[PDB]
From a paper:
Phycobilisomes (PBS) are antenna megacomplexes that transfer energy to photosystems II and I in thylakoids. Here we show the cryo-EM structure at a global resolution of 2.9 Å of the 5.9-MDa PBS from Anthocerotibacter panamensis (hereafter A. panamensis), a recently discovered Gloeobacterial species that diverged from Gloeobacter spp. around 1.4 billion years ago. The A. panamensis PBS features a configuration comprising two herein characterized linkers and presents a paddle-shaped morphology.
However, both ApcD and ApcF are absent in the A. panamensis PBS. Although ApcB3 only exists as a single copy like ApcF of hemidiscoidal PBS in each bottom core cylinder, ApcB2 (β3) is found at the positions occupied by ApcF in other pentacylindrical core structures and is likely the functional equivalent to ApcF that occurs in crown Cyanobacteria. Additionally, the position of ApcD is occupied by an ApcA2 (α1) subunit in the paddle-shaped PBS. Both linker-guided and non-linker-guided pathways are identified in the pentacylindrical core. The final overall resolution of APC core complexes ranged from 2.38 Å to 2.73 Å, allowing the assignment of all APC subunits precisely based on the corresponding amino acid sequences.
Author numbering:
A (entry chain 0): 891 to 939
B (entry chain m): 2 to 67
C (entry chain i), D (entry chain h), E (entry chain j), F (entry chain k), G (entry chain g): 1 to 162
H (entry chain 0): 792 to 840
I (entry chain c), J (entry chain d), K (entry chain b), L (entry chain a): 2 to 161
Write the structure that this text describes.
Amino acid sequence: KQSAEVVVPSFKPVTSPRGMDMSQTPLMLQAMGDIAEAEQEVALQKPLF
Amino acid sequence: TRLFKVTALIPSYKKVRGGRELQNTYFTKLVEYDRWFAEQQRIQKQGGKILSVKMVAGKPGLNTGV
Amino acid sequence: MQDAITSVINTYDVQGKYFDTSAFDKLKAYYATGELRVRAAGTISANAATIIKEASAKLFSNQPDLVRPGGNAYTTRRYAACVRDMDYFLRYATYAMLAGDTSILDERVLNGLKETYNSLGVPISSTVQGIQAMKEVTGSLVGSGAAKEMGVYFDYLSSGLS
Amino acid sequence: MQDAITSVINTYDVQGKYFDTSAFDKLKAYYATGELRVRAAGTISANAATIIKEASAKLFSNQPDLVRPGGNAYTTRRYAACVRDMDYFLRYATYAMLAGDTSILDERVLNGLKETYNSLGVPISSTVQGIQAMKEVTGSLVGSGAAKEMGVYFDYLSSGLS
Amino acid sequence: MQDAITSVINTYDVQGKYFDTSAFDKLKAYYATGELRVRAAGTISANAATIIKEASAKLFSNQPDLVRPGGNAYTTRRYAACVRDMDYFLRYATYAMLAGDTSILDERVLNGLKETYNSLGVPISSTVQGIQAMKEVTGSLVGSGAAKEMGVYFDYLSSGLS
Amino acid sequence: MQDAITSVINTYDVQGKYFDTSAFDKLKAYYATGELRVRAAGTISANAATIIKEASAKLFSNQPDLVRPGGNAYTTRRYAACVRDMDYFLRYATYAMLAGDTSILDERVLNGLKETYNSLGVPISSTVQGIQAMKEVTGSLVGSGAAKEMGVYFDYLSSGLS
Amino acid sequence: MQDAITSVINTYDVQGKYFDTSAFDKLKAYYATGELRVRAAGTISANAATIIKEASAKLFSNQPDLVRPGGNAYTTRRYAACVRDMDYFLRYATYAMLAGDTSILDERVLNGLKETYNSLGVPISSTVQGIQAMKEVTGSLVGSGAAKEMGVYFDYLSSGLS
Amino acid sequence: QALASSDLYRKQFFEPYPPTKNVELSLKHLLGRATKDQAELRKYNQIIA
Amino acid sequence: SVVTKAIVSADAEARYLSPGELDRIRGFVSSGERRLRVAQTLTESRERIIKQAGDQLFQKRPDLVSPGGNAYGAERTASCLRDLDYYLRLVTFGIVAGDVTPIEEIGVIGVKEMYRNLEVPLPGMVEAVKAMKSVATGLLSGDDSAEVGYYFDYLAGALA
Amino acid sequence: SVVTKAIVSADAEARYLSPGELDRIRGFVSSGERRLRVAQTLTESRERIIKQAGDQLFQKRPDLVSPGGNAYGAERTASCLRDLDYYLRLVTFGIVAGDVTPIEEIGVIGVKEMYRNLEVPLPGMVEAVKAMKSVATGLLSGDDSAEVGYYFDYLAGALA
Amino acid sequence: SVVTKAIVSADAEARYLSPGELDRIRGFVSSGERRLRVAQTLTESRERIIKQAGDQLFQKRPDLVSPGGNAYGAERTASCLRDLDYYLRLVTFGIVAGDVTPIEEIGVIGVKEMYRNLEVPLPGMVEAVKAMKSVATGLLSGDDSAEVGYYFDYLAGALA
Amino acid sequence: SVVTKAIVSADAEARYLSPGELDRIRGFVSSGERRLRVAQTLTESRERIIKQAGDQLFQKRPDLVSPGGNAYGAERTASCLRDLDYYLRLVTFGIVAGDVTPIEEIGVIGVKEMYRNLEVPLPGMVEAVKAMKSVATGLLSGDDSAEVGYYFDYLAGALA
Ligand SMILES: CCC1=C(C)/C(=C/C2=NC(=C\c3[nH]c(/C=C4\NC(=O)[C@H](C)[C@H]4CC)c(C)c3CCC(=O)O)/C(CCC(=O)O)=C2C)NC1=O
Ligand SMILES: CCC1=C(C)/C(=C/C2=NC(=C\c3[nH]c(/C=C4\NC(=O)[C@H](C)[C@H]4CC)c(C)c3CCC(=O)O)/C(CCC(=O)O)=C2C)NC1=O
Ligand SMILES: CCC1=C(C)/C(=C/C2=NC(=C\c3[nH]c(/C=C4\NC(=O)[C@H](C)[C@H]4CC)c(C)c3CCC(=O)O)/C(CCC(=O)O)=C2C)NC1=O
Ligand SMILES: CCC1=C(C)/C(=C/C2=NC(=C\c3[nH]c(/C=C4\NC(=O)[C@H](C)[C@H]4CC)c(C)c3CCC(=O)O)/C(CCC(=O)O)=C2C)NC1=O
Ligand SMILES: CCC1=C(C)/C(=C/C2=NC(=C\c3[nH]c(/C=C4\NC(=O)[C@H](C)[C@H]4CC)c(C)c3CCC(=O)O)/C(CCC(=O)O)=C2C)NC1=O
Ligand SMILES: CCC1=C(C)/C(=C/C2=NC(=C\c3[nH]c(/C=C4\NC(=O)[C@H](C)[C@H]4CC)c(C)c3CCC(=O)O)/C(CCC(=O)O)=C2C)NC1=O
Ligand SMILES: CCC1=C(C)/C(=C/C2=NC(=C\c3[nH]c(/C=C4\NC(=O)[C@H](C)[C@H]4CC)c(C)c3CCC(=O)O)/C(CCC(=O)O)=C2C)NC1=O
Ligand SMILES: CCC1=C(C)/C(=C/C2=NC(=C\c3[nH]c(/C=C4\NC(=O)[C@H](C)[C@H]4CC)c(C)c3CCC(=O)O)/C(CCC(=O)O)=C2C)NC1=O
Ligand SMILES: CCC1=C(C)/C(=C/C2=NC(=C\c3[nH]c(/C=C4\NC(=O)[C@H](C)[C@H]4CC)c(C)c3CCC(=O)O)/C(CCC(=O)O)=C2C)NC1=O
Ligand SMILES: CCC1=C(C)/C(=C/C2=NC(=C\c3[nH]c(/C=C4\NC(=O)[C@H](C)[C@H]4CC)c(C)c3CCC(=O)O)/C(CCC(=O)O)=C2C)NC1=O
């Protein structure tokens, strides 16, 4: 009976932060560079005309 | 029904303990009826072999008084 | 546990039939005696400690060897266990009387009692005589009809032990 | 529990031998049938409620007395326990089918179910009829090969109860 | 917890939107990085003990008072707990890198760590120094791009502790 | 918890006084309202699931954003948690009404609700509006006499939340 | 458990006697053997791991099939369990020798050892041979006089196992 | 189990407190730890409800 | 019954029945004749109550007897009325018992999973027991109708 | 009280009050006025009740008021009568509450520790409570006397 | 997600991911492109899938849009189709995720309570998701249709 | 194995295996053929692996075979090689199983106590296992070496 307060009311959700999208992440940047190469290869797979 | 008398052996597989464990492996206990499903499931999940279960308190097949 | 009402309900339910005239007759018989049972239970609860004191004194006067050295009731521990067992018998007999049915007795007292007492070395006959002493004290204390009612359940306990 | 791979591992371990040609033959036999087992298990998972409902309808139609008053499956509580038992039987048979071994039925199904039913008063023959009903209903759903495979574990359950 | 896939799913679920071209591009980018992430995770897992040894060696070389008598890492319990915390940080950094998302770092590492350490007298700056030493050791083992990626999660831990 | 009778008893026990005429007047008032309270509690027990249905429907009609994507009550889990919270509020309001005292709303309900809801991001204004919605539905259900009484406890809950 | 002194006290308590000349004589006998018992217990305490090593070596040399595949001591877990059991037997025999009474063996070691070993599949005859092997090794260290006294409790353990 | 499910335990630790506090108190008494995560809080709150 | 509940509450604390428990037992036994007459009244009228309640059931919710409905067909309608007969018998048992434990342990515990296994809609069953409540309370006096309606309300709340 | 016990029992099962619980509370509140006039009778004549109970206790137990007794003297006898007055007020509290709960928290929990610390013999308390039972029940009618005697019996059993 | 389950399973055992789990993640990452193509195929045709599944549902269960049915009315039918669209979106989510984790977290946990508070029949939900399965697997090649049917089957089993 | 872990994880939650777990089992059975090929390759090279592993251990740690060493003598050196053969068999079992669970159950639990009782030096175990790993990986191709060396690494960590 020292305290009637709730020590753990709930846990704050961590589902979404504010900012830091991690799309500027350098290896994400490298992947976005590589998908461009893949799209270009698919484009050159089409007939030349 | 209300009471099962259960004799069970629970061996050990995860580790060899410094404690004696003669207490916990071979035992007989009284588990009340609506605890028996959970208790039996836990005993089976620990790897034990249920040696016997008996009726002691209630009467099988009773409708009221359960 | 089953009282008289739940016992009747259970029988008619396993038959799967509505209540008949005999069922209502048993229910009237139970409701008729309910006030007598409540008075007896209140009188017993009011005098439970007194009943146990007189019954244990009578038991250990008729069998002084029980509490003398070498008797099963010789220690503070085993004497306490003896009087606690008498307390259990009295309270559960009162329960069975108020329920009007003996199912609580074999459900919560008699199941495994004889084996336990034999493994411990508790004399069954002396326990029966303790129940009889409790029966006499309680019957003198409650009154003739309540005496007969409580005696039914005391005799049930005695027959279950012996 | 042990699956087929762990089964052959244990069998070759108990003699302390390395895997022979026959052991690798057994393992190839299991890995070849694994994909059929995965379709069978996914199909059964999709239709567990349907299978249990059809099997219970068949069991209680072939034995109408089970759910009429006086029967073992007569109450909402006891009926619900019955269909819970059939649900557990079906899911554990699916487990044993995926594993390719009847061991999990020994460790986690038959491990004290026999004498639990015996003390409860659950009729064995009716439970076998329910297991057979689940067997037919599940086979008609999973096709011929998965039906034979599931039926093996279903008869394991039946004979364990018998 | 969240990974990159789950993060895109959540941002398109709050809006009640089916996936657009942008979401498919983000999913493609993660699926492209997956091979590098798995390679780095396997390398770190094979070398966790080496990383902990080297990082704790630099930490205790720079902060010798931590292992001199009376220091927070002075006893076998407290040294073992220190290197256990370093192993925790390495494991959860590897989880986070494999997920592509730092939510696990907040949920399962940073939550209450600051006042855990403050209630125990664990120095937080020296823990951050240990994390930086761990980052330097890991970068040499996983290669330049994996080093840059792993530095993000180590720096997330360091900033959350600071 | 504490009810009107127990509140009077404790008030007089702290003073160490036998019951005066004012205490008997308060007890008379509670005994007089007891029949109304029992009838209202029975009606609410009979229609609680209904009450929750119309209250939730009204709240999500007045604020459709709560159950549309992006709203706090948008998912199956969060919708179910919303309904469960409303079931708490209704049941504890009925308890407090039957008691004639708002204490149980203090112990079992309002203690720490703000902290839980601000930790979860649960909108306290919308929860108050849901409590009001339950207030109209329950007051319309119970009748003119009991609606005023139950409003006291619903508004007490709302003021504790806001 | 009871030692020699507690055994004499209990045999005098059961008959309700103060100590006579014979009781003091038996006490004097125990306090005469006390120094020998303490010296032997300390010697065994210093050499427990050794005595276990030669005892297990003798058991496995005489019965090699126990540790090859198919034997009950074949695995690291089962070999560790075997030597653990032997260490328990040695420790409890030392307790019994120091106490001077064999009640500790029945109360702790032998109560339920038959059921446990037979259900597990532990071979009793081999375990008895291990008891004898341990006794023979211990006798060489304790000294000629203390060897027979410790052998008393070793044969007690064996016969309880046998 | 019989102590923790007794009416005395309920008077001491179930009745005086909200269900969240109930979860953390019973977890302290019976499992030796506070409430572990949000999923645990949800599970035991649902059972209490 | 009330006696069993009082006894188990006393037994859990290893005590005799308190003055409150004995008082409630007296209140129960003194009311035995009235509730017993109520149970009889419900017993003789069981066929009429079941048939009117089923008629009201089908009138209010016709999907059950409409194509694609659970009660569609003759034998399924007979089973529909058989369930109502079961529950009326359990209501009489609850009335003589003075508490809803016979109802709870014969026809309430596990009822959700049972009717789920049977594809029986619990809103439809709640409409069934409300029709039974209306019919049964119609044949009773107000003082008796109150207690009978309380048990029917308990059943309706428990079913869904 | 009766209401509080019903509420906490129902809250222990996360349910609303059963028909039996509501019936029990209804019977309790319907009996409020006889309870209140019984409390009137006990309060209006508390001085006479305590005086007569003290006389009976000290005549059946002269050792208490003899030298060496716990209640010997003027002030200790006053404290004895003060304890009796406490317990009479507690019985009135329990009567209005409809259960022995107020008696139980105010005067039964820890009573054995208190009276051991004070060296008040518990059989003396039992005799005093029996005397006060007889005196107070002599003032009431049979129906009320039995009800208050159950409270005095509960108190005596707690002291015993 | 597949990575999330692998990480959580490893965390529960307080260990690094084993080469088996890393190979599982490697295979999932490899099949990500096929998964995205399937998800786009199901997204581009969501209007047609919803319309055809609603049709098939209402021919196979006319009672739902019949009087007394939950989907009765144009507004309630629009809510029905809106729920179908929710679940199709969750199916595409679970396709790209590689597991049913988004489906379970968004649309399966507490769905029984939500639909009970909504008075929505669960067999209706199961029939509707079976309709969506038929329509959506009709739009896909055999290999992709099988893996989409797996998610639809999980949804049907979780609703049933 | 992987199947057993998936089954026990599903049974812990009392559910059927999710489409993700089924896909994991599908990948496992796909990799089974390569796993048996690797285990066959190590099983064929029994005596080679044992011979070079023992020679490297004895040259790297002459003290073990020298006077006073634990393996001094023909029979003790034979027991050393026998233990190596045991552990190589366990590694083959682990290769077929897909995880270190058989190694864990047969030769890792209580190994330190066993070698303490046998007075076997644990660092000698670690070095012998490393030598076995080197020989086994050498006799393999580039692909098989990684997965085989993982099990030897686990075993050495268990001994260390
Ligand atoms: C302090 C009193 C006490 C003792 C002594 C005791 C013994 C004991 N030995 C056990 C198993 C065992 N005991 C042995 C030993 C046997 N195997 C070989 O055949 C040898 C001949 C022989 C030993 C000399 C083995 C191998 C096992 C493992 C059985 C299994 O695989 O389950 C177990 C089961 C749980 C466990 O493995 O830890 C107990 C309880 N229990 C107690 O409460
Ligand atoms: C070895 C453990 C043990 C003890 C201690 C023990 C005591 C004991 N004392 C008893 C009676 C008694 N005991 C006492 C002693 C009290 N008289 C005064 O008040 C004193 C304050 C106090 C003693 C200094 C008296 C007077 C009786 C007789 C009461 C009666 O029979 O009515 C009885 C019941 C029947 C009998 O033996 O005569 C027991 C069992 N029994 C045991 O097995
Ligand atoms: C609720 C129903 C219930 C009953 C009835 C019951 C009986 C019971 N009595 C016991 C002991 C005992 N019971 C007695 C009483 C007997 N011996 C005396 O001589 C008398 C003749 C006789 C009583 C009239 C004694 C002396 C013991 C001590 C046994 C011992 O320690 O050796 C024990 C062993 C456990 C313990 O002592 O804590 C049980 C289980 N247990 C229950 O749960
Ligand atoms: C004493 C406790 C108890 C109850 C209540 C009980 C009911 C019960 N009703 C059943 C069938 C049924 N019950 C119904 C009734 C439904 N039809 C409409 O949907 C209505 C909403 C509703 C009736 C108001 C129907 C239609 C069936 C047949 C279902 C089928 O064959 O698939 C069955 C399956 C076997 C049988 O045909 O009898 C049971 C066990 N059993 C018990 O042991
Ligand atoms: C995981 C494996 C496993 C199973 C299967 C299992 C079954 C099981 N069934 C039980 C009761 C029951 N089981 C049944 C089922 C039977 N009645 C019908 O006639 C059928 C023929 C038959 C089922 C097809 C019934 C009716 C009961 C209630 C018995 C009673 O309360 O009297 C109980 C008693 C405890 C409880 O219900 O909580 C168990 C443990 N336990 C396990 O650990
Ligand atoms: C009070 C309890 C306690 C202990 C015991 C303890 C031991 C300890 N020994 C250390 C280093 C060391 N310890 C040793 C000792 C080993 N060299 C040989 O191999 C021997 C087998 C063995 C000693 C007999 C050596 C050589 C180092 C230096 C490691 C290095 O320079 O890389 C360190 C690293 C930090 C430092 O050197 O200041 C610690 C913490 N710390 C504690 O808080
Ligand atoms: C993403 C997870 C999620 C889901 C799935 C969800 C469904 C959902 N459906 C609702 C209404 C509804 N839902 C339905 C659909 C049903 N009617 C028929 O019987 C069919 C069997 C069945 C659809 C196949 C209907 C008819 C309503 C209107 C109910 C009413 O207005 O009373 C509502 C109430 C508020 C609103 O209309 O927006 C919700 C929250 N909410 C969520 O957060
Ligand atoms: C009896 C005292 C008591 C109460 C009332 C209580 C409520 C409570 N509400 C919770 C979550 C919640 N509560 C709500 C309900 C709100 N969100 C909607 O928007 C509405 C506006 C509003 C209800 C009308 C929701 C949606 C959640 C889920 C939050 C989340 O998990 O993200 C939780 C966390 C556990 C869980 O999600 O199951 C608790 C403990 N706890 C207590 O100890
Ligand atoms: C409302 C609950 C409550 C109670 C009951 C209570 C009793 C109580 N009685 C006390 C003293 C006392 N009580 C008594 C009464 C005893 N003497 C005889 O033996 C009789 C058997 C018996 C009374 C019938 C006596 C004589 C004292 C004086 C003791 C002393 O001063 O040493 C005291 C110490 C303070 C004082 O001296 O005034 C308390 C607190 N206090 C409470 O808060
Ligand atoms: C299948 C799992 C399993 C294992 C691993 C196992 C190990 C094991 N090794 C043993 C002996 C031995 N093992 C060794 C090996 C050591 N010598 C050097 O120190 C080296 C560092 C090292 C070898 C690499 C030696 C020398 C002995 C003889 C012990 C002695 O006679 O003192 C024994 C005693 C029984 C016997 O000799 O047959 C066991 C049980 N047993 C098992 O059931």
